[PDB]
Protein backbone atom coordinates (compact mmCIF):
# COMPACT_ATOMS: atom_id res chain seq x y z
CA UNK A 1 0.00 0.00 0.00
CA UNK A 2 1.05 3.66 -0.25
CA UNK A 3 2.54 4.85 3.02
CA UNK A 4 1.84 8.50 3.97
CA UNK A 5 4.56 9.87 6.30
CA UNK A 6 3.71 13.12 8.09
CA UNK A 7 6.06 15.45 9.94
CA UNK A 8 6.20 16.76 12.56
CA UNK A 9 4.11 14.59 14.86
CA UNK A 10 3.40 17.49 17.23
CA UNK A 11 3.26 21.22 16.52
CA UNK A 12 3.57 23.51 19.57
CA UNK A 13 2.90 27.07 18.44
CA UNK A 14 1.91 30.49 19.74
CA UNK A 15 -1.00 32.52 18.38
CA UNK A 16 0.00 34.53 15.30
CA UNK A 17 3.03 32.44 14.41
CA UNK A 18 3.17 30.53 11.09
CA UNK A 19 3.12 26.76 11.08
CA UNK A 20 3.36 23.96 8.60
CA UNK A 21 2.99 20.20 8.25
CA UNK A 22 4.57 18.04 5.52
CA UNK A 23 3.41 14.74 4.05
CA UNK A 24 5.47 12.25 2.04
CA UNK A 25 3.89 9.45 0.02
CA UNK A 26 5.69 6.27 -0.97
CA UNK A 27 4.39 6.52 -4.56
CA UNK A 28 3.65 9.61 -6.67
CA UNK A 29 0.06 10.81 -6.11
CA UNK A 30 -0.20 12.16 -9.65
CA UNK A 31 -2.95 10.10 -11.30
CA UNK A 32 -3.11 9.15 -14.95
CA UNK A 33 -6.07 11.54 -15.27
CA UNK A 34 -3.91 14.50 -14.42
CA UNK A 35 -5.24 15.08 -10.92
CA UNK A 36 -3.34 14.63 -7.64
CA UNK A 37 -5.76 13.19 -5.10
CA UNK A 38 -4.17 14.59 -1.94
CA UNK A 39 -6.28 16.15 0.76
CA UNK A 40 -5.75 17.53 4.31
CA UNK A 41 -8.25 16.96 7.13
CA UNK A 42 -8.58 18.37 10.64
CA UNK A 43 -10.16 16.47 13.54
CA UNK A 44 -10.91 18.03 16.86
CA UNK A 45 -11.29 15.78 19.89
CA UNK A 46 -14.54 13.88 19.99
CA UNK A 47 -15.58 15.26 16.59
CA UNK A 48 -15.40 13.88 13.10
CA UNK A 49 -12.71 14.86 10.61
CA UNK A 50 -13.39 17.84 8.39
CA UNK A 51 -11.73 18.38 5.04
CA UNK A 52 -9.77 21.60 4.67
CA UNK A 53 -7.80 21.28 1.43
CA UNK A 54 -8.29 19.04 -1.58
CA UNK A 55 -6.41 18.36 -4.86
CA UNK A 56 -3.23 19.61 -3.12
CA UNK A 57 -4.14 23.33 -3.02
CA UNK A 58 -7.88 23.92 -3.25
CA UNK A 59 -9.59 25.32 -0.14
CA UNK A 60 -12.87 23.88 1.04
CA UNK A 61 -15.86 26.21 1.51
CA UNK A 62 -15.70 28.12 4.75
CA UNK A 63 -12.01 27.35 5.45
CA UNK A 64 -10.04 30.50 6.34
CA UNK A 65 -7.61 31.93 3.83
CA UNK A 66 -4.87 31.39 6.44
CA UNK A 67 -4.66 27.78 5.18
CA UNK A 68 -2.78 26.93 1.99
CA UNK A 69 -1.64 23.68 0.45
CA UNK A 70 1.23 23.06 -1.93
CA UNK A 71 3.39 20.31 -3.39
CA UNK A 72 3.53 17.70 -6.11
CA UNK A 73 4.65 14.15 -6.78
CA UNK A 74 5.38 12.58 -3.35
CA UNK A 75 5.89 15.71 -1.23
CA UNK A 76 3.23 18.04 0.16
CA UNK A 77 2.83 20.85 2.69
CA UNK A 78 -0.07 22.30 4.59
CA UNK A 79 0.71 25.87 5.69
CA UNK A 80 -1.05 28.08 8.23
CA UNK A 81 -0.04 31.74 7.80
CA UNK A 82 -0.93 32.63 11.41
CA UNK A 83 -2.24 30.15 13.93
CA UNK A 84 -5.47 30.98 15.79
CA UNK A 85 -6.76 29.36 18.95
CA UNK A 86 -9.46 27.43 17.07
CA UNK A 87 -6.92 25.69 14.77
CA UNK A 88 -6.14 23.08 17.45
CA UNK A 89 -6.62 19.41 16.67
CA UNK A 90 -5.10 16.61 14.72
CA UNK A 91 -4.26 17.19 11.01
CA UNK A 92 -4.13 14.27 8.55
CA UNK A 93 -3.00 14.03 4.96
CA UNK A 94 -4.81 11.41 2.92
CA UNK A 95 -4.44 10.06 -0.64
CA UNK A 96 -7.09 8.79 -3.01
CA UNK A 97 -4.91 8.05 -6.01
CA UNK A 98 -3.91 4.46 -5.20
CA UNK A 99 -6.02 1.65 -3.76
CA UNK A 100 -6.33 1.23 -0.85
CA UNK A 101 -6.74 4.88 0.07
CA UNK A 102 -4.47 5.75 2.97
CA UNK A 103 -4.01 8.32 5.71
CA UNK A 104 -1.03 9.79 7.54
CA UNK A 105 -0.70 9.15 11.27
CA UNK A 106 -1.74 12.64 12.22
CA UNK A 107 0.03 15.79 13.46
CA UNK A 108 -1.34 17.21 16.72
CA UNK A 109 -1.38 21.02 16.81
CA UNK A 110 -1.31 22.49 20.33
CA UNK A 111 -1.27 26.14 21.36
CA UNK A 112 1.17 27.88 23.69
CA UNK A 113 -0.01 30.75 25.86
CA UNK A 114 0.79 32.65 29.10
CA UNK A 115 0.70 30.92 32.47
CA UNK A 116 -2.78 30.93 34.02
CA UNK A 117 -3.46 29.78 37.56
CA UNK A 118 -6.47 27.49 38.14
CA UNK A 119 -9.67 28.45 39.88
CA UNK A 120 -10.49 25.70 42.37
CA UNK A 121 -13.83 24.23 43.48
CA UNK A 122 -14.67 21.33 45.77
CA UNK A 123 -17.82 19.18 45.74
CA UNK A 124 -19.12 16.81 48.44
CA UNK A 125 -20.69 13.50 47.54
CA UNK A 126 -24.34 13.90 46.70
CA UNK A 127 -26.88 12.53 49.07
CA UNK A 128 -28.06 10.43 46.14
CA UNK A 129 -24.69 8.68 45.85
CA UNK A 130 -24.43 8.14 49.59
CA UNK A 131 -27.94 6.68 49.65
CA UNK A 132 -26.69 4.31 46.90
CA UNK A 133 -23.75 3.18 49.06
CA UNK A 134 -20.59 4.95 47.81
CA UNK A 135 -18.84 8.32 48.07
CA UNK A 136 -16.85 10.40 45.55
CA UNK A 137 -15.34 13.74 46.65
CA UNK A 138 -14.47 15.92 43.64
CA UNK A 139 -12.07 18.86 43.15
CA UNK A 140 -12.16 20.91 39.94
CA UNK A 141 -9.23 23.04 38.66
CA UNK A 142 -10.58 25.30 35.92
CA UNK A 143 -9.03 27.15 32.99
CA UNK A 144 -5.36 26.88 33.71
CA UNK A 145 -2.12 26.61 31.79
CA UNK A 146 0.20 24.71 31.52
CA UNK A 147 -1.36 21.31 32.00
CA UNK A 148 0.90 20.26 34.87
CA UNK A 149 -0.50 20.64 38.40
CA UNK A 150 -0.37 19.05 41.83
CA UNK A 151 -3.61 18.16 43.66
CA UNK A 152 -3.50 16.83 47.25
CA UNK A 153 -6.46 15.67 49.35
CA UNK A 154 -6.70 16.04 53.12
CA UNK A 155 -9.31 14.26 55.23
CA UNK A 156 -9.35 15.49 58.86
CA UNK A 157 -5.87 16.89 58.23
CA UNK A 158 -4.60 13.54 56.90
CA UNK A 159 -2.82 13.89 53.54
CA UNK A 160 -4.34 11.18 51.38
CA UNK A 161 -2.49 8.63 49.26
CA UNK A 162 -3.41 5.98 46.75
CA UNK A 163 -7.13 6.92 46.57
CA UNK A 164 -7.54 9.68 44.02
CA UNK A 165 -7.51 9.89 40.26
CA UNK A 166 -7.29 12.92 37.97
CA UNK A 167 -8.66 13.54 34.49
CA UNK A 168 -7.72 16.40 32.18
CA UNK A 169 -9.81 18.02 29.41
CA UNK A 170 -8.58 18.62 25.91
CA UNK A 171 -7.19 22.11 25.26
CA UNK A 172 -9.84 24.81 25.01
CA UNK A 173 -10.49 26.01 21.47
CA UNK A 174 -11.00 29.65 22.54
CA UNK A 175 -8.54 30.40 25.39
CA UNK A 176 -6.09 27.48 25.08
CA UNK A 177 -6.42 26.46 28.71
CA UNK A 178 -7.08 23.09 30.37
CA UNK A 179 -9.33 21.93 33.19
CA UNK A 180 -8.78 19.04 35.55
CA UNK A 181 -10.96 16.97 37.87
CA UNK A 182 -9.65 14.99 40.82
CA UNK A 183 -11.90 12.36 42.42
CA UNK A 184 -11.21 11.08 45.91
CA UNK A 185 -12.85 7.68 46.36
CA UNK A 186 -13.92 6.50 49.83
CA UNK A 187 -16.41 4.02 51.14
CA UNK A 188 -19.60 5.52 52.52
CA UNK A 189 -18.63 4.35 55.99
CA UNK A 190 -15.21 6.00 55.78
CA UNK A 191 -16.69 9.20 54.40
CA UNK A 192 -19.20 9.34 57.25
CA UNK A 193 -16.42 8.72 59.78
CA UNK A 194 -14.59 11.97 58.99
CA UNK A 195 -15.37 15.65 59.06
CA UNK A 196 -13.07 18.02 57.17
CA UNK A 197 -12.46 17.43 53.48
CA UNK A 198 -9.97 19.61 51.60
CA UNK A 199 -8.21 19.71 48.24
CA UNK A 200 -4.93 21.65 48.05
CA UNK A 201 -3.67 22.80 44.66
CA UNK A 202 -0.15 23.78 43.61
CA UNK A 203 0.50 25.28 40.16
CA UNK A 204 3.19 27.35 38.47
CA UNK A 205 0.78 30.32 38.35
CA UNK A 206 0.26 30.32 42.13
CA UNK A 207 2.84 31.79 44.53
CA UNK A 208 1.34 29.72 47.36
CA UNK A 209 -0.98 26.67 47.28
CA UNK A 210 -4.75 27.17 47.23
CA UNK A 211 -7.05 25.12 49.47
CA UNK A 212 -10.81 24.60 49.19
CA UNK A 213 -12.67 22.66 51.85
CA UNK A 214 -15.97 21.69 53.39
CA UNK A 215 -17.11 20.11 56.65
CA UNK A 216 -19.32 17.04 56.26
CA UNK A 217 -22.84 17.89 57.36
CA UNK A 218 -21.89 21.58 57.06
CA UNK B 1 -26.52 21.12 3.03
CA UNK B 2 -24.98 17.68 2.79
CA UNK B 3 -25.77 15.61 5.90
CA UNK B 4 -24.51 12.10 6.73
CA UNK B 5 -26.31 10.66 9.82
CA UNK B 6 -25.07 7.38 11.22
CA UNK B 7 -26.79 4.81 13.36
CA UNK B 8 -26.10 4.62 17.11
CA UNK B 9 -23.53 2.82 19.15
CA UNK B 10 -23.34 -0.97 19.28
CA UNK B 11 -22.13 -3.58 21.75
CA UNK B 12 -21.68 -7.00 20.14
CA UNK B 13 -20.19 -10.32 21.25
CA UNK B 14 -17.09 -11.83 19.66
CA UNK B 15 -17.91 -13.87 16.55
CA UNK B 16 -21.07 -11.91 15.80
CA UNK B 17 -21.93 -9.44 13.03
CA UNK B 18 -23.17 -5.84 13.03
CA UNK B 19 -24.68 -3.57 10.33
CA UNK B 20 -24.09 0.21 10.63
CA UNK B 21 -26.14 2.71 8.58
CA UNK B 22 -25.37 6.14 7.10
CA UNK B 23 -28.52 8.06 6.13
CA UNK B 24 -27.81 10.89 3.71
CA UNK B 25 -29.62 14.07 2.73
CA UNK B 26 -29.03 17.27 0.77
CA UNK B 27 -27.65 15.88 -2.51
CA UNK B 28 -28.54 13.21 -5.09
CA UNK B 29 -27.35 10.06 -3.28
CA UNK B 30 -26.72 8.01 -6.43
CA UNK B 31 -24.11 10.49 -7.68
CA UNK B 32 -21.47 10.35 -5.01
CA UNK B 33 -19.15 7.57 -3.78
CA UNK B 34 -19.62 6.59 -0.13
CA UNK B 35 -16.53 5.54 1.89
CA UNK B 36 -16.26 3.85 5.24
CA UNK B 37 -13.33 4.53 7.54
CA UNK B 38 -12.17 2.95 10.85
CA UNK B 39 -10.59 4.89 13.64
CA UNK B 40 -8.86 2.96 16.46
CA UNK B 41 -6.16 4.21 18.86
CA UNK B 42 -2.85 3.17 17.52
CA UNK B 43 -4.18 2.05 14.08
CA UNK B 44 -5.17 5.63 13.22
CA UNK B 45 -7.57 6.24 10.31
CA UNK B 46 -8.02 3.28 7.93
CA UNK B 47 -10.06 3.17 4.75
CA UNK B 48 -12.36 0.13 4.61
CA UNK B 49 -13.77 0.57 1.15
CA UNK B 50 -16.31 2.47 -0.89
CA UNK B 51 -19.51 1.96 -2.91
CA UNK B 52 -20.98 3.95 -5.76
CA UNK B 53 -24.71 3.95 -5.09
CA UNK B 54 -25.69 4.60 -8.77
CA UNK B 55 -24.57 1.10 -9.79
CA UNK B 56 -23.45 -0.69 -6.58
CA UNK B 57 -19.81 -0.79 -7.68
CA UNK B 58 -17.54 -1.48 -4.71
CA UNK B 59 -13.84 -1.23 -3.94
CA UNK B 60 -12.49 -2.79 -0.76
CA UNK B 61 -9.23 -2.58 1.11
CA UNK B 62 -7.82 -6.07 0.96
CA UNK B 63 -7.31 -5.85 4.73
CA UNK B 64 -11.12 -5.65 5.20
CA UNK B 65 -12.40 -7.74 2.27
CA UNK B 66 -13.26 -10.79 4.37
CA UNK B 67 -14.75 -8.61 7.15
CA UNK B 68 -16.83 -5.88 5.50
CA UNK B 69 -19.78 -5.82 3.09
CA UNK B 70 -21.06 -2.53 1.67
CA UNK B 71 -24.59 -2.04 0.31
CA UNK B 72 -26.97 0.85 -0.32
CA UNK B 73 -30.75 1.36 -0.28
CA UNK B 74 -31.44 4.06 -2.86
CA UNK B 75 -35.05 4.40 -1.74
CA UNK B 76 -33.97 5.71 1.65
CA UNK B 77 -30.72 7.37 0.55
CA UNK B 78 -28.85 5.18 3.03
CA UNK B 79 -25.52 3.39 2.86
CA UNK B 80 -24.78 0.34 5.02
CA UNK B 81 -21.70 -1.48 6.21
CA UNK B 82 -21.87 -5.00 7.64
CA UNK B 83 -18.87 -6.27 9.69
CA UNK B 84 -18.73 -9.98 10.44
CA UNK B 85 -16.68 -12.46 12.51
CA UNK B 86 -16.00 -9.68 14.96
CA UNK B 87 -13.10 -9.68 17.38
CA UNK B 88 -11.78 -7.20 19.92
CA UNK B 89 -9.53 -5.60 17.25
CA UNK B 90 -12.73 -4.51 15.51
CA UNK B 91 -13.69 -2.25 18.40
CA UNK B 92 -13.42 1.25 17.02
CA UNK B 93 -15.29 4.31 15.78
CA UNK B 94 -16.52 3.86 12.24
CA UNK B 95 -17.28 6.81 9.91
CA UNK B 96 -19.02 7.11 6.58
CA UNK B 97 -17.46 9.80 4.41
CA UNK B 98 -18.58 11.02 0.96
CA UNK B 99 -16.55 11.31 -2.22
CA UNK B 100 -12.94 12.44 -1.70
CA UNK B 101 -13.64 12.50 2.04
CA UNK B 102 -15.51 15.80 1.73
CA UNK B 103 -18.37 15.25 4.21
CA UNK B 104 -18.28 12.91 7.19
CA UNK B 105 -20.82 11.26 9.42
CA UNK B 106 -20.69 11.76 13.20
CA UNK B 107 -19.21 8.29 13.76
CA UNK B 108 -20.57 5.06 15.26
CA UNK B 109 -18.85 3.48 18.25
CA UNK B 110 -18.59 -0.27 18.14
CA UNK B 111 -17.46 -2.31 21.10
CA UNK B 112 -16.79 -6.04 20.67
CA UNK B 113 -16.95 -7.68 24.10
CA UNK B 114 -18.57 -10.54 26.00
CA UNK B 115 -19.68 -8.04 28.66
CA UNK B 116 -23.27 -6.93 29.14
CA UNK B 117 -24.28 -3.28 29.05
CA UNK B 118 -24.25 -1.33 32.31
CA UNK B 119 -25.94 2.05 32.58
CA UNK B 120 -24.24 4.95 34.37
CA UNK B 121 -25.06 6.29 37.77
CA UNK B 122 -25.64 9.99 37.41
CA UNK B 123 -25.00 12.14 40.47
CA UNK B 124 -25.07 15.89 40.93
CA UNK B 125 -21.96 17.88 41.80
CA UNK B 126 -23.23 20.75 43.90
CA UNK B 127 -21.38 23.43 45.89
CA UNK B 128 -21.60 23.35 49.67
CA UNK B 129 -16.00 34.11 45.25
CA UNK B 130 -17.67 35.55 42.19
CA UNK B 131 -17.63 32.24 40.33
CA UNK B 132 -19.25 28.97 41.34
CA UNK B 133 -19.20 25.57 39.69
CA UNK B 134 -21.68 22.70 39.44
CA UNK B 135 -21.69 19.47 37.49
CA UNK B 136 -22.70 15.86 37.05
CA UNK B 137 -20.70 12.71 37.70
CA UNK B 138 -21.45 9.91 35.18
CA UNK B 139 -20.08 6.84 36.98
CA UNK B 140 -19.33 3.17 36.20
CA UNK B 141 -20.88 2.44 32.80
CA UNK B 142 -20.16 0.11 29.91
CA UNK B 143 -19.55 0.31 26.94
CA UNK B 144 -18.74 3.75 25.48
CA UNK B 145 -20.18 6.19 24.53
CA UNK B 146 -22.23 8.57 26.65
CA UNK B 147 -23.42 12.03 25.61
CA UNK B 148 -23.88 14.87 28.07
CA UNK B 149 -25.56 18.22 27.49
CA UNK B 150 -26.85 20.95 29.82
CA UNK B 151 -30.41 22.31 29.56
CA UNK B 152 -30.88 20.26 26.37
CA UNK B 153 -27.91 22.00 24.80
CA UNK B 154 -29.13 25.53 25.42
CA UNK B 155 -26.36 26.06 27.98
CA UNK B 156 -22.84 26.01 26.56
CA UNK B 157 -20.95 28.92 28.14
CA UNK B 158 -18.67 27.69 30.88
CA UNK B 159 -19.29 23.99 30.21
CA UNK B 160 -16.44 21.48 30.37
CA UNK B 161 -17.20 17.83 29.67
CA UNK B 162 -14.27 15.62 30.61
CA UNK B 163 -13.18 12.68 28.44
CA UNK B 164 -14.35 9.23 29.41
CA UNK B 165 -11.75 7.32 31.39
CA UNK B 166 -11.60 3.53 31.44
CA UNK B 167 -11.03 2.44 35.01
CA UNK B 168 -8.73 -0.34 36.09
CA UNK B 169 -11.69 -2.60 36.92
CA UNK B 170 -13.21 -2.34 33.49
CA UNK B 171 -15.92 0.36 33.61
CA UNK B 172 -15.92 3.96 32.35
CA UNK B 173 -16.62 7.22 34.11
CA UNK B 174 -16.67 10.85 33.17
CA UNK B 175 -17.93 14.16 34.52
CA UNK B 176 -19.24 17.41 33.15
CA UNK B 177 -18.98 20.76 34.92
CA UNK B 178 -20.22 24.30 34.43
CA UNK B 179 -18.78 27.45 35.91
CA UNK B 180 -21.42 30.11 36.58
CA UNK B 181 -21.77 33.43 38.43
CA UNK B 182 -22.22 32.59 42.09
CA UNK B 183 -25.47 34.62 41.98
CA UNK B 184 -26.91 31.97 39.65
CA UNK B 185 -26.79 29.31 42.34
CA UNK B 186 -30.16 28.13 43.56
CA UNK B 187 -31.98 30.50 41.18
CA UNK B 188 -31.21 29.33 37.64
CA UNK B 189 -32.13 25.92 36.20
CA UNK B 190 -29.21 23.56 35.54
CA UNK B 191 -30.20 20.17 34.14
CA UNK B 192 -27.56 17.70 33.00
CA UNK B 193 -28.86 15.44 30.22
CA UNK B 194 -27.08 12.06 30.08
CA UNK B 195 -27.79 9.49 27.38
CA UNK B 196 -26.19 6.04 27.38
CA UNK B 197 -27.80 4.52 24.34
CA UNK B 198 -26.43 0.92 24.73
CA UNK B 199 -28.33 0.48 28.00
CA UNK B 200 -31.27 2.73 26.99
CA UNK B 201 -30.39 4.94 29.97
CA UNK B 202 -31.56 8.56 29.68
CA UNK B 203 -31.29 10.78 32.75
CA UNK B 204 -32.17 14.48 33.19
CA UNK B 205 -30.76 15.48 36.54
CA UNK B 206 -31.52 18.87 38.08
CA UNK B 207 -28.39 20.14 39.85
CA UNK B 208 -29.03 22.40 42.86
CA UNK B 209 -27.01 23.47 45.92
CA UNK B 210 -26.73 21.20 48.97
Amino acid sequence: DVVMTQTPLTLSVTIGQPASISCKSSQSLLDSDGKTYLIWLLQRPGQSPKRLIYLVSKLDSGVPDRFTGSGSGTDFTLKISRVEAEDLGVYYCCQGTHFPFTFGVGTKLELKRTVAAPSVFIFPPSDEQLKSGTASVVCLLNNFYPREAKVQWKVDNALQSGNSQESVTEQDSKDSTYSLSSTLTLSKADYEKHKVYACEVTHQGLSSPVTKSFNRGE
Amino acid sequence: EVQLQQSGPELVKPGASVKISCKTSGYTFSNSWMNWVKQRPGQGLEWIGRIYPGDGDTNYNGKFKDKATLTTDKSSSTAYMRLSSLTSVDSAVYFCARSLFDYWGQGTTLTVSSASTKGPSVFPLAPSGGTAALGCLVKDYFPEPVTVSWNSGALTSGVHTFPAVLQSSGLYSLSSVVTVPSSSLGTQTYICNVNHKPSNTKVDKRVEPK
Binding site: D31, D33, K35, Y37, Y54, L55, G96 | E1, V2, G26, Y27, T28, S30, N31, S32, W33, Y52, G54, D55, D57, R98, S99, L100, D102
Partner: peptide, 14 residues
Protein backbone atom coordinates in the same frame (compact mmCIF):
# COMPACT_ATOMS: atom_id res chain seq x y z
CA UNK C 1 -29.60 20.59 -3.39
CA UNK C 2 -25.84 20.90 -3.50
CA UNK C 3 -24.24 20.34 -6.90
CA UNK C 4 -23.50 16.79 -8.12
CA UNK C 5 -22.72 15.11 -11.45
CA UNK C 6 -24.57 12.00 -12.54
CA UNK C 7 -21.50 11.01 -14.60
CA UNK C 8 -19.59 8.38 -12.67
CA UNK C 9 -15.89 9.24 -12.25
CA UNK C 10 -13.02 7.85 -10.19
CA UNK C 11 -13.64 10.62 -7.63
CA UNK C 12 -16.85 12.54 -7.29
CA UNK C 13 -17.66 16.13 -6.20
CA UNK C 14 -14.39 17.70 -7.25
Amino acid sequence: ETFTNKLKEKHTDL
